[model samples]
Target: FKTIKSDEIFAAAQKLMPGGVSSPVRAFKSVGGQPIVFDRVKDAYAWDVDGNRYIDYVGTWGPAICGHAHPEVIEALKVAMEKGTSFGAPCALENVLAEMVNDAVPSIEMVRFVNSGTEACMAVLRIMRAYTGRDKIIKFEGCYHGHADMANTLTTPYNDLEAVKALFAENPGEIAGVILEPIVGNSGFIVPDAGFLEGLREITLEHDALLVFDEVMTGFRIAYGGVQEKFGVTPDLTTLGKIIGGGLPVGAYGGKREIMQLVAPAGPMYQAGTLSGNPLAMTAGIKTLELLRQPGTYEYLDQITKRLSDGLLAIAQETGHAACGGQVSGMFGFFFTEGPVHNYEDAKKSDLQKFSRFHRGMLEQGIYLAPSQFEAGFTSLAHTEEDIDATLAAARTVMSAL
Candidate 1:
C-alpha cells in the first residue's frame, strides 16, 4: 500500500521526462493520481516500485496475452538475444513470423513490419492513397488510427454506413479508402453495428476504394486472426500490433499480395525502418503465436473476460449506478451510462468524475485497469478464476460506494 518509491521516482522523472512518463497516459492525469512506477511483472500480476501487487487488466496495454514473461517466450527471447539483438539485415526469423501472420489472417498475403502500432497505421494509410492514386481517405470517429497527418483524412461517426457512403459520394474519385477499427478499442471498445463491416466492404468495393481495418488493438487479442476472422469480413489492408510482438515493440501491415507488392523495392511507395524486422521482436512474436494457436487459449480468454464484464455490470445494476458493459473475447469495457454506447457521442455521456473515483478505488484494492474512461481493458491467459472473483469483489465494493 506504500507508494514511497513510486512517488519519489515520479517526482524525479518529471524533471527528466515530459509529464514524468514516456507515454502521456502513464502520467495518471486523467484518472487523477500519481502513477505507479512498475518494477516487475509476471503472469497476471505487476508490482510497482513501492512493492504493491496488482492483478493487471491493462496487460501492458494489450500485448501480454500469455501474461508477462511467460517462461517459454522469455526463453525464446534469451536464445534470440544470444545471437544478437539487431541484425540490421534480413533474418530467417522474419520469414517465420511473416508466414505465421499470412497463414492466420486470410486477407494478409504479405506483411511489412515496423516498431509500433502508430507506424503500422501510418504506413497503411499512405499505401492506400498511393495504390489507389487518390488524395483523400475516410476514417471513422473513435477509431483512432494513430497520430498521423494526411490531407483530407475525413472522419465520420462510427457504425454509420450511410455517412461513409456519403463521404465517398461527396469526395468522388478522390476518396482512396475507408479506415476503421474492426472493433474499436481507443473509444471504449465499441463493436461494429450488425452488418456494418459487410456494408463498408460493399460500399468501398463499389466505389473503387480500399477498405482498411486498423486492427492494432484487436489483432491477436480479440481472436487469433483478429476481428476479420471473428466477423468473417476481409479488409484490403490490415494494420496489426500488440500481441504479435509478444509484449515487445513491433507493428505490421499486410493484405492481398497485389496491394502489398506496391511497397518498398517491389514498387514506387517508399517506407523504410532501420529495425523493422529485427530478430528479437520476431522471435517473441513467433513463440507467442505458437502458444496462442494451442487449443482452448482464446476460449479461456473469452470466458474469463465475459465473466469479469458481466460481474461488473451486475454489481453496477444492483448498486443502482446506471452502467453498461460489453466484451469480445479478451477485450471488454464498461461505461457509467444508462444504456448501450454505439459511438463516441454515446460513450461521452458516461460520468468521468464517477469513473475517476472508481478507478482509484479499484487501484487501492490491487486491481489495475487502463487509466482512462475511454480506453478498453484486456484480459490474458495469465488471469485465473480467482483473479476474476477478486476483481469482482473489489468492483462490488467500489460500485456500492459509487
Candidate 2:
C-alpha cells in the first residue's frame, strides 16, 4: 500500500547513476511513475522494498525460465563457488556446458561462451565479416540482435521475403550476413510468417551470405532446441543467452565446426573475455538445462502459457478492449490493437497511453508485467494454474474500470 521507502531510495539513486538506474527501461518513464525497488525474488514472485508481493512474469527479461532462484541451480552454484569465481583459463566445466549446448541447439556443432548476448553477436559478426571480406549486415526493423555500431548495416521488413531479396540483389558483394530473432521477442513477441524462415535460408544460400539467428531471448525457451528445432531450419550460426547461463551473465555463438573454428585460439577470427567460461556460470547453465530436460518441462510451460495468453485475449474481448497476441511455450505478448501484427510497422498500431494506464492498474493488484508496450512477457515452470487465474482475474478487475 506504500512506496515510501522505494521513492526515498530511488530519489538518491538518480544522483549516483545515469537516469536513476543502470538500464533505462527499469526507470519506469514509459509508464510515468517511480519504479519499485526489488528486495527479493523467488519462483513466480517478487517482493519490493515496500513488502508488496507480485506475480512476476518479466523473469529478469527471460532468464528465469526455470523460475527465480531455483534451488538446484543455486545449489550447483554453491558447489562451484569454492572453485574460485574465475580461472582466467580453461576449465573442464566449459567443455561440459559447451557439449550440452551443442547437443541441444540444432545449428550448434561447436560453441564459444561470452559475457552477454551482445558479445556473442559481435563475435559472430566479426567472423562473418572476416570470412567474406564483407562489411555490412542485414537486420530486421524490430528484431533485436544486440546493440552494435557496425556501420553500413541494412534493414528490411520482417516476414517479407521479397524485400530481403531486393536488398541482397543491390548489395550482394558487401553483405556479410543476415541476423534476427527467429521468433521476435524483442518487439513484443511477433512470430515469423509461414515460409519466411525457409525463404531466408534459401536466398542466403543462393547469395552465399551467412544467416544468423539471435536466439538470445528465444533460445532454450521456445523449445529445448529453440526456434531452429521447432521450425527445422538451422541457421548458419546462432547467438544465445538468458536461460543458458541460468540467470548468470553468459552468452554464446555456435554453428558448424568449420565456421565456429574461425573464432580464435581455434583459428583467426579473434574474440576473448577474461571471465568467459567461469565455472559458476557454466554450472548454473548446466543445472538449468538439466531441470528443463525433465520429461514434462516444456509441455508444462506450453500449457500454463496457453492458459495465460488465451485468458488475456478473452478478458480483453469480454471487457471490450481491442487487443491481440500469441504464444509459443513460455513466451507471449499483447498489444492494444485488433491486429494480426506482422512487423514493426504493424505493431505501431498499439495504443501506448491505454497500455500505460493498464500497466499501473495491474501493478496495483500485485501483478508484475514488463513496463513497456513493446516488451514480451515470460512464464516459468514455477508458475501454477492458480497464478494464471489470479493474473487473468486481476486484468479483468482493472481493465473493466480502464
Candidate 3:
C-alpha cells in the first residue's frame, strides 16, 4: 500500500542486524512490510532514505513528545554539550530535574534517573524486593514493563484479569510487588474497566505488596501527574521515560521516601548508573518539563486526541468497519473489531489483518502509525487540526476499502 520501500537496505541489514532491526516491532513483521530507513525529521514530519515524507505519530517509539528536533529541547542540549556531554559523575541537573519531577508527581518525594525505562523499572523492582523482603511479585498480563525477565508474563487467555488476581493470590509470601500500566499500552490503548485499576490497588493492599505503575509510555504524555493522578490510584513505586527525557534517553523511578531511601548508600538495595543523570539528558528533560509546565498544555493535547478519536470512529462507522476507541491526554487507540478491550483477551479479538491493511494505506498517504496494531498512538502540541483532518480523510478511504 505504501510506495516507500527499503528492500535493498533490509536485505543488507538482515545479515548484519538480527531481523533487520534493533527492536522486534521495528521489523514491520506484523504488518507484512519492510522497514523504512529514516534520514531526517523535523517537527511532526520524517523523511525516509527513499525521499519519502510522512507524518510521524510513533515519535521515535517514545520520546519526541513536543516533536522531533524541537528548538528549545535542542537548544538546551547544545548548551549542555558545550559544557560537557557526560562527566561520568554527578551533575547539578540531576538534582534540578529530580526537584522538577517531585514537584509534578505528588507520590514521589525523591527520585533517581537511569538510562532507559528498562533500567529504571528493573532497578525499582529490585528495590521493592529488598525493602519488602519478598521474592515473588504480581504483574498484570499485557502491560509491558520493559523487557525485564520478572515482568515478562501476562494474564492467561489475554482478558483474564481474575485469573491474574488468582495467580497473585496463589503466590502469597513470594510476592513483593504488583506492577502494571494503568492504561494498557503494548496491547493497544485499552483503558481498564471502571473498577479494574482499583481492583489491582486493592489486591496489592490486601496482599501487603507494593503496587508499581510502569508509566514509561504514559508519563508526561498522558498527564503531567501521569496515570496515577489521572486514574486517582497511586502506586507504591512508579517508572517514567519518554517525554520526561525530551527525546533524549533518560528514565526515572521513585515513590514514598521510606521505600526509595532503601536504595544504595542510604540502604542495602544498590543501583547505580554512570549515565543515569547525564547532563544532556537532564537539559532536554528540564526544557521539556518547562514547556509542559505552561498552562493549557494538557488541555490542548486532550482536545486533539478527542477530535482524532471521534473522527476515526466516525469513519469506522460510516465505512461499515467494526471499531471502538479510547483516549487520554494525547494518547489514544482503537480496535478494528468489537468493544470492551478491558484486558488482553479483548485486544486480541480485534481484526488485526484489517488494522494492518489500514496501516499500509495510511503509510501510503504519508501518515505513519506504529507498525504493530498493539502499540498506542501519540499526539503532541506539534500535531495540527489540518493533520487530524487529513488523517481522518485518509482513513475514510482506507475503511471504505475494508
Candidate 4:
C-alpha cells in the first residue's frame, strides 16, 4: 500500500505539470492526498508505481466498459499501429467506425469524429447557433463546462420542463437549442424523471429549438444508444465520447441527416481536426463496441454496479451513516446525505467533508474511486461480484470511522 515511488514521481511532476498531473482531479485535490501514479492497468485492476494493485472502479472515467486493454482491442491496435499513427488524410477505418456509430445510436444518422468531448460540445454549440440563427442555448444548472460572451446561455434545472418552457417562452426566436447530459454526471449521478425528456422534445419542436444530449458520459455506458434509447426520447443532436474511443481520446457529434449536412463540405458551418478520425481510436472504439454487442454485456454491468452501489449504501446504514446512491448499467454514485437527489440543488445536500474522508480511506484500502463528490464512478465489465464484495468490506471499515 506504500506509494513511495508515487510520492517521489509526483514530487518531481509538480514542477512540470501545473497540478502534478495532466488533469486536475488526478492530483487528488478534492480527496486531499498525493495521487497514486498508475504504472499499468488491465482487466479490473490498476498497479500503481509503487506496485500496489487496486480494484479500479473509475474505468478511465467511462471508456473501459469491456475493461482496460481488452485482448481484441489491443490486438486490433497492434495491426492498426503497423499501418502508421496519424493519417491526416482519409482512412477506411473512419467509414467503419462511423458505420458502427450511426447504426448503434438512434438519432445519429450522420456523425463526425473529434479528439475530445469538449471539442464535440463546442462544435455542436456552433452548429446549433448556425442552424437556428439564434444566439442563445438553454442548458441545465450543472451542465455548464465553459463560459461565453457572444452567445446567450440560458439556465434551467435538470428535471424541470416548466423552467425550460419558461425560458423558451420568454426568449422566443433568440433561443437556439436545449442541451443536457440526459443523466447528470457532473453533480454526481442523477437520472431524469418521467416525461422530462419527452416534454423537452415536444417543447423544442413547438418552439423550433433543437434538443442536444451531451452524452459524453452516458453514451454507450448506460446503454448502446445511451439515455436516448433507454428513455425512448431521441434528441435533435447528440455529443459522444469516452466509450466511443474505447480507452483513447475520442469524441463525436451527430444527428439527423438534414442537420448534419450543415457541417463543412456539405454546408456553411465549418469544423475540422487533423486527428479527427485517427486509425487507432477508431480501431479501439470499434473493437470495444463489438465486445458490448455480445449478449448479456449490459446485464452483467447492471448486476455488478447495482450490487456495489446497494452494498455501499447498506454498509453506510449499518455503520450509522446517511447515504443515498444509484446505479444504471456501468455508472453509479452516492451522496453522504439522507435524501433522494434529483438536481444539482438536491445534490448539494451531500456532506462533502464526509465524502472526502471516505474517499481517502477507500484509496488507502486499495479501492480506486473518483476523487470528488461531484464526479460519477464507473464500473467495467471486468469488475466481479468478489471485487464488489471486497469494496463493500473496505467501505464498511471506512464508514465505521466516519
The segments of candidate 3 whose C-alpha lies over 4 angstroms from its true place after superposition are: 1-5, 151-165
Better of 1 and 3 by TM-score: 1
lDDT by residue (tens digit), candidate 4, 284-402: 99999999999999999999999989998888889989889898988998899987988999888999989998988998888988988888899988888899888989988888898
TM-score of each: 0.99, 0.99, 0.95, 0.97
Displacement of the residue 384 alpha carbon in candidate 4, Å: 1.3
Residue pairs that clash (backbone atoms under 3 angstroms), model 1: none
Q: What are the per-residue Cα lDDT tens digits for candidate 1 across 131-150?
A: 99997989877778778765
Off by over 4 Å in 4: 144-151
For residue 326, model 4's alpha carbon misses the true position, in angstroms, by 0.6
Per-candidate local distance difference test: 0.92, 0.91, 0.83, 0.89
Q: Arrange candidates by lDDT, highest first: which order?
A: 1, 2, 4, 3
lDDT score for candidate 4 against the true structure: 0.89
Error of 2 at 16 (Å): 0.5
List all candidate RMSDs to the true structure: 0.9, 0.9, 2.0, 1.4
